[PDB]
From a paper:
However, in enterovirus-infected cells, the ACBD3 GOLD domain interacts preferentially with viral non-structural 3A proteins, which causes re-localization of ACBD3 to the sites of virus replication. In this study, we present a structural, biochemical, and biological characterization of the complexes composed of human ACBD3 and the 3A proteins of four representative enteroviruses.
The second strategy took advantage of the fact that in all three solved GOLD: 3A structures the C terminus of the ACBD3 GOLD domain was located in the vicinity of the N terminus of the ordered part of the 3A protein. This allowed us to design GOLD-3A fusion proteins with the last residue of ACBD3 (R528ACBD3) fused through a short peptide linker (GSGSG) to the first predicted ordered residues of the respective 3A proteins (e.g. K153A/EVA71). The overall structures of all solved GOLD: 3A complexes are highly similar to each other. Analysis of the crystal structures of the GOLD: 3A complexes revealed that the 3A proteins formed either one of the crystal-packing contacts (as in the case of EVD68 and PV1) or contacts with the second 3A molecule when two GOLD: 3A complexes per asymmetric unit were present (as in the case of EVA71 and RVB14). The dissociation constants of the GOLD: enterovirus 3A complexes ranged approximately from 1 μM (EVD68 and RVB14) to 15 μM (EVA71).
Numbering used by the authors:
A (entry chain A): 368 to 436, 474 to 528
B (entry chain B): 16 to 55
Write the structure that this text describes.
């Protein structure tokens, strides 16, 4: 049994990108037609995963898969969200011991690379 | 501070200020991903 994720947005994109550039590299440049996958392993102490992402000039494909410990459950289906307008955020409870797969999918984009500002947290 | 309470907090009210407060309170721990896969 897997719990449904929580998903929302918040209006301030500028404050987000400003702080992401601040902290680390933490910015994925997604080439034309490329698909980047960020692997976030689950924490024993941790119950929850939190993700935030935004883009500069264009939308990008985003979804979340959970890999067990190779079966794959679909947490967030991959669709095109507009992160250039606002910051997209979400959270999910651990189904168990495994690894989260954060998908950034630029495949549909012929001529345009995508700069992805993202951040990750976990509770406990 | 229960995890589901932290989630409802960030979901209901969300800003860099709240993100930093939760961080400072240890309610959320920043995490660097282990690997980044690329492909076409």
């Amino acid at each position: 049994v897997i719990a449904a994720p929580s998903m929302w947005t918040r209006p301030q994109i500028k404050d987000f990108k400003e702080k992401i550039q601040q902290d680390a590299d933490s910015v994925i440049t997604v080439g034309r037609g490329e698909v980047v996958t960020v692997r976030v392993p689950t924490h024993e102490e941790g119950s929850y995963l939190f993700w935030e992402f935004a883009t500069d000039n264009y939308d990008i494909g985003f979804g979340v898969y959970f890999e067990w410990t190779p079966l794959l459950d679909e947490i967030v289906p991959v669709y095109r969200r507009d992160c250039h307008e606002e910051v997209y955020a979400g959270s999910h409870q651990y189904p168990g011991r495994g690894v989260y797969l954060l998908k950034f999918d630029n495949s549909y984009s012929l001529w345009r690379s995508k700069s992805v500002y993202y951040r990750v947290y976990y509770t406990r | 501070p229960a995890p589901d309470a932290i989630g409802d907090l960030l979901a209901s009210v969300d800003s860099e200020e709240v993100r930093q407060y939760c961080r400072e309170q240890g309610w959320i721990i920043p995490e660097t991903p282990t690997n980044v896969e690329r492909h076409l």
